[PDB]
Structure 1
Amino acid sequence: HEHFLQCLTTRISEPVIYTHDDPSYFTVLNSSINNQRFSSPSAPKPFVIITPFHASHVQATVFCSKKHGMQIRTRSGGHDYEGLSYVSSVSFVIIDLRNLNLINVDVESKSAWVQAGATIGELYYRIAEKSENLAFPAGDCPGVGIGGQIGGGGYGYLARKYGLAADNVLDAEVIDVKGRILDRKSMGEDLFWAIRGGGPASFGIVLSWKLQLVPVPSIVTVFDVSRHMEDDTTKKFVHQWQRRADKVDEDLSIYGRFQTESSVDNEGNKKIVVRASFRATFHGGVDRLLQLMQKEFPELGLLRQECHEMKWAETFLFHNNFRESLDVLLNRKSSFKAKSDFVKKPISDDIFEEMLGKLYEKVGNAFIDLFPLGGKMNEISESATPFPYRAGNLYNIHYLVGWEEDITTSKKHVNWIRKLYNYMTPYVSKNPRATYLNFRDLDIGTNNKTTSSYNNIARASIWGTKYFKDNFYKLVYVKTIVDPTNFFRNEQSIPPLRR
C-alpha cells in the first residue's frame, strides 16, 4: 500500500488526499453515506479518499490504482441503495466527486454543462436562476448526485412528458481505463449509449454531462392528499389509477404511497390502519388540472383547496416538505432496504388488498410507492438507452422498509421485505423480473468474485437481464471493447469477454 501512496503523492502535487490518520477522513467518508446500513465501523473502509478538483487528479488516481492493484469506487451523491460507491470487499479507494459540481446553464441553446458531482438540487437551482420556463427531467430527492442518477436512468414527474434524464443527455466527458479524457464524438456512440443508464461504474468515470433543457410553463400545480382506504371511492380510484395513470395527459404524473400506522377506534381500542397518499405535479394551471381530474379520476374527489400553484422549481420544495423556504435550500439519516418491480397488467383488487395487508407486520416503517409510466416513455425505443422497460409497462412498484441504526432488528427487516417480494412474484413482470437499476438490489444476483469469462457472463446475465433485458448483450460488447482487463468492477458490473 505504501507504494500506492507515494505514487499518489508524486502525481498529485498538492486537500485532495485523505488517509485514515487525517482527522477529516471519517467526516468526509460519512458525509455522503446515505444508507446507514453501511456506516457501521465493521463495514469495509477505503484505504484513502480522493476528492479531486481537476480531471488530472482523477487521471492520476486511475494510473496509480491500476499500477498497484487498488480498486476504485466512484462516489457522486452516495445514494446507492446498496452502498456500492463507498464499500468494497477488496482493498479500495473512493474517488468522491463532490468538488466537481460546476454548472454552466445556457438559456439560448437550452442546454447545460454539468460536472458529475453536482446534485439534483444544485442543478434545479441553477436552472431557475436563469429562467422560470426551463427544466430538466430528473428525480425529486435534491441530495442525489447527477452522476449516478443519469448513470442509471433518472425518473421523475417529467418522465411521462420528456422521458428519463438519460434520454435528455447531449454529450459527456469520461475518463477511461487508459486515463484518456473522452467526449461523445471521441468515445463513440456505443460507450455514449452505455453510460446513459447502463451504470457508468462498469466502464469508467464520468466527469460531466451536457444536458438538454426542456420547456415548462411559468405556473405548475401540485398536490399531496390523503384518502381513506375503507371508502369505496378510494378503492375505485386505485383500481382506475392502475388502468389509467399511464394513459392520461402527459402533463400529469400521480404517485401513490401506502403505509400502516398505529391508531385507535372511537372506543380507544388499538387498531392498525393503512394510510393512502397521492402526490402529483401537473405541468399546467389548476383549472385545467381540475377539469382533467373530473374527466379521468372523479373518484379521487380532488379539491381546489388541495392544489397549489407555483413555479416549476418550487415544486421540489413542496414535494420535499419545505412548505417559507427559499430555493437556496436546494443547495444544502436512516438505514433501509428497498426492492421494486414493474407491472404490465393491473393487479386485481383482492390481491392488492392482500399485498397491503403485509404492511400490518411493519407498522410505520414500511412503504409501498407506485410510479406511473407510459406517456413519452411509450414512444421511446427499448434500445434507445440501456433502460429497456418502455411500452408494455404500466407502472413501477417500489417497496421500502427503514429503521434507525443502533442489532438483529436489521435481519428481521430484511427478511420481511424479501417475503413481500416473493409474494408479489406472480403479479409482476417475469422472464426477466424487470428491475430499475437506480433501485439497486444485490439480492437479484451478483458476480463471481477466477473462472472463465463465459461463466462470468452467464452468471452476470442473471442480474443483468433483470436491469437491462436484451440490452445486456450490447453492454457486454461495449465492456469488452473499452475495459477488456476489467479494471472498473463491482459486485454488479458488466464483465468482458476474454479470448
Structure 2
Amino acid sequence: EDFLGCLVKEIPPRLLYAKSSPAYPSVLGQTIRNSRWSSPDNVKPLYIITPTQVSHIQSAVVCGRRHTVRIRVRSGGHDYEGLSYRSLQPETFAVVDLNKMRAVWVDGKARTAWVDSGAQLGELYYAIYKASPTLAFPAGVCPTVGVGGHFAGGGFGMLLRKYGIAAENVIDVKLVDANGKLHDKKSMGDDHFWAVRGGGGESFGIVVAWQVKLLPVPPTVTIFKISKTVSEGAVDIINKWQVVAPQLPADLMIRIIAQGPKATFEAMYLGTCKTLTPLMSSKFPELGMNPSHCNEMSWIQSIPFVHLGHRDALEDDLLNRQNSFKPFAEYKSDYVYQPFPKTVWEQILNTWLVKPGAGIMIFDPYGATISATPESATPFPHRKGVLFNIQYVNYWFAPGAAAAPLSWSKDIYNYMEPYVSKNPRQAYANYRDIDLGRNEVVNDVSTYASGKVWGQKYFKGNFERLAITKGKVDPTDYFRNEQSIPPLIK
C-alpha cells in the first residue's frame, strides 16, 4: 500500500501499473520473449513502473528502499530465465521497465553515442547508420535485445573478433545505485565501473544510459553462408575449422550453426569478395568457398542478413517492437579450449542433433581481439585460449511439450562435459542458465557461498572482485535476483 503511495507521490500515475490495472497484462507481456515465462503460473510483479525520465527511476528506487520492496529492472526482456520480470518462487517485487527510455544520440564526428538502456540493439545500430554508413558498434546479432541487459552481461556478436565485447567499448555510463544516487564513471570509481561493464545485469544498479565508442567498418562487408552435410565432409571440415577459425585474421569471423547432420558456416568479413576469396583459399580451402558464395552489403545490412537471411527490409527488421516471436525456450552454453576429437564431432552431428527434442548448436570462434584482453581486465573472463563458445538453443511452440527438449538440453550437457572447460565449467552470463546454480538468501542477503557456485562459471577468477564491489555499492543486497552477485562485506 505505502510503496505504491510513495510512487504515486513522485511519478506520473500513468506510468504505474498494479495487477488490477487494465493495461498491466499487456505491459508485463510486451517484452517477454519466452513462452515458458509468460503463463499464469509464473510469479508476477506487484507493480510495474515504466519511467520516461531518470528522475522517475531515482524516485522508484528511493521508494523501494524506504518501503523495502525490491525491484527487478527490465530493458529488452530477453533474459533467458525471465529474471527481469519474474521470480522463481513467490515473493514481492516491482518491475522497473525501461522500454520508454530508448533514445540513441550519435555524435558521428566524435565517434561516440549515448544509448538509453531501453533501446533495442536494432535501434542502436540503425541510429548509427543514420549518422554514418561506415561506423559500427560490436554487439549482438538479435535486433530486439535490450541494450541494458546485453551490455551489463558483456554482449558479443559478429564483430567480436575485431573489437571484443560490447561492454569493453563502453566509455561512460549514467547509473542509479541502490540508494537512488545518480552516478557516472567518475563518481563510481574503478571497481564499480569495472563491474557494471560485464558483471551481469541487476547486481550493480540500474544503468540508465551507456556512452559508447563507435568503430570504423568498411563501406562494403561480405557475408557467406556455406552448408556442408556429413556426406559433404562436415566432420572433417568442422574438425579443421576449430583450429583455423580462432587463428584467422581479425577481419574474418566464421561462426557455425548446426541442427542435424549438417553444419552451416556463416562468415562476416570486413572487406570485399575480391580479397576474401584468396584469403579463404589460403587459410581454409577445405570449406570450398568461391566468389558465388559472397554477399556484399553495408555493415547495417549485415545485421538483418546474418540473423534473418533478409536482404531487403532494413527498417522493418531493425525497428521492431511487435514482439511476434515467443518460443518456449531453453538455453545452455560452454567454452572450449582444446580441440574436440573427430569422434566427438561425429557424435554431435550424427547422433546428438538427431534426437527427440534436439536443439540447435551455435559455435562462435574467439581468438584475435576478444582473446587479447586479459581475463581480469573486465568481468568477462572467457578470453585467451578460447577456441570457441557453444550455445545450445532449444525452441518449441506448444505448451506441455517441454519434457523432451529439457531432457535433451541436460543430456547433451552431460555428454559434452569431458570436452569443454572445467574447474570451473565456464558459461556466458548473458546465456543465463539457472541450472548452473542459484543463490540462497539468509537474513535477507544472498550468500557468498551460494553465489560462488554459478558465479565462478560466468566470471571465473573475477567473481570475488565482483562480490567485494557488490558489498561496497549494495551491502544490503537490494538489487538482486536468484543469480545475482552476492555482497562480500567485512
Confirm or deny that 1:424 pairs with 2:416.
Answer: yes
Confirm or deny that 1:23 pairs with 2:22.
Answer: yes
- What amino acid does structure 1 have at the position aligned with 2:182? I
Instruction: Identify the residue that residue 492 of structure 1 maps to in structure 2.
Output: 483
Deviates further, 324-333 or 392-401: 324-333
* Partner SS state of residue 44, structure 2: coil
Shift of 1:389: 1.1
Shift of 1:287: 1.0
Deviates further, 11-20 or 48-57: 11-20
Shift of 1:348: 0.5
Instruction: Identify the residue that residue 245 of structure 2 maps to in structure 1.
Output: 245
- What amino acid does structure 2 have at the position aligned with 1:358? W
- What amino acid does structure 1 have at the position aligned with 2:485? I
* Distance across 2 between alignment mates of 1:406 and 1:451: 37
Superposition pairs of residues 258-407 of structure 1, within 5 angstroms: 258-260=258-260, 274-319=261-306, 320-332=308-320, 333-356=326-349, 357-362=351-356, 366-407=359-400
* Distance across 2 between alignment mates of 1:21 and 1:480: 37
Per-residue CA shift, 1:199-221, capped at 9, x if unaligned?
13012100000001101000100
Per-residue CA shift, 1:347-400, capped at 9, x if unaligned?
01111211231122136x610111000011222111111001111111001112
Instruction: Identify the residue that residue 453 of structure 2 maps to in structure 1.
Output: 462
Shift of 1:326: 3.3
* Partner SS state of residue 27, structure 1: helix
- What amino acid does structure 2 have at the position aligned with 1:125? Y
- What amino acid does structure 1 have at the position aligned with 2:152? G
Shift of 1:125: 0.4
* Distance across 1 between alignment mates of 2:231 and 2:334: 26
- What amino acid does structure 1 have at the position aligned with 2:412? L
Instruction: Identify the residue that residue 468 of structure 2 maps to in structure 1.
Output: 477
Contact 1:314 1:327 in 2 (8 A): no
Deviates further, 139-148 or 195-204: 195-204
* Distance across 2 between alignment mates of 1:275 and 1:236: 12
Shift of 1:317: 1.8
Contact 1:37 1:405 in 2 (8 A): no
Contact 1:317 1:327 in 2 (8 A): no
* Distance across 2 between alignment mates of 1:200 and 1:80: 10
Per-residue CA shift, 1:87-128, capped at 9, x if unaligned?
023111111100111111001111001111111000110001
Shift of 1:498: 4.2
- What amino acid does structure 1 have at the position aligned with 2:69? M
* Distance across 2 between alignment mates of 1:314 and 1:152: 25
Instruction: Identify the residue that residue 323 of structure 2 maps to in structure 1.
Output: none
Contact 2:197 2:379 in 1 (8 A): yes
Confirm or deny that 1:174 pairs with 2:178.
Answer: no
Instruction: Identify the residue that residue 122 of structure 1 maps to in structure 2.
Output: 123
Shift of 1:251: 0.5
* Distance across 2 between alignment mates of 1:303 and 1:93: 54
Instruction: Identify the residue that residue 61 of structure 1 maps to in structure 2.
Output: 60
- What amino acid does structure 1 have at the position aligned with 2:118? G
* Distance across 2 between alignment mates of 1:378 and 1:359: 29
* Distance across 1 between alignment mates of 2:216 and 2:175: 28
Instruction: Identify the residue that residue 79 of structure 1 maps to in structure 2.
Output: 78
* Distance across 2 between alignment mates of 1:219 and 1:323: 14
Provide closer, same or farther for how the CA distance between residues 30 and 474 of structure 1 changes in structure 2, counting only shifts above 3 A. same
RMSD of the alignment, in Å?
Answer: 1.5
Per-residue CA shift, 1:409-440, capped at 9, x if unaligned?
21332122101101100000001101110111
* Distance across 2 between alignment mates of 1:315 and 1:382: 30
- What amino acid does structure 2 have at the position aligned with 1:258? A
Instruction: Identify the residue that residue 402 of structure 2 maps to in structure 1.
Output: 410
* Distance across 2 between alignment mates of 1:290 and 1:15: 57
Contact 1:125 1:328 in 2 (8 A): no
- What amino acid does structure 2 have at the position aligned with 1:70? V
Contact 2:472 2:489 in 1 (8 A): no
Shift of 1:493: 1.1
- Give the structure-1-normalised TM-score: 0.94
Instruction: Identify the residue that residue 266 of structure 1 maps to in structure 2.
Output: none
Superposition pairs of residues 218-233 of structure 1, within 5 angstroms: 218-232=219-233
Per-residue CA shift, 1:317-349, capped at 9, x if unaligned?
211222331335311120111111000011011
* Partner SS state of residue 78, structure 2: coil
* Distance across 2 between alignment mates of 1:7 and 1:411: 44
Moved over 4 A (4+): none
Confirm or deny that 1:433 pairs with 2:425.
Answer: yes
* Distance across 2 between alignment mates of 1:498 and 1:190: 15
Gaps of 5+ in 1: 261-273
Contact 1:114 1:209 in 2 (8 A): yes
* Partner SS state of residue 354, structure 2: helix
* Partner SS state of residue 331, structure 2: strand
* Distance across 2 between alignment mates of 1:163 and 1:231: 33
Gaps of 5+ in 2: 321-325
Q: Aligned pairs, how many?
A: 481
Per-residue CA shift, 1:464-487, capped at 9, x if unaligned?
111111111111110111001111
* Partner SS state of residue 238, structure 2: helix
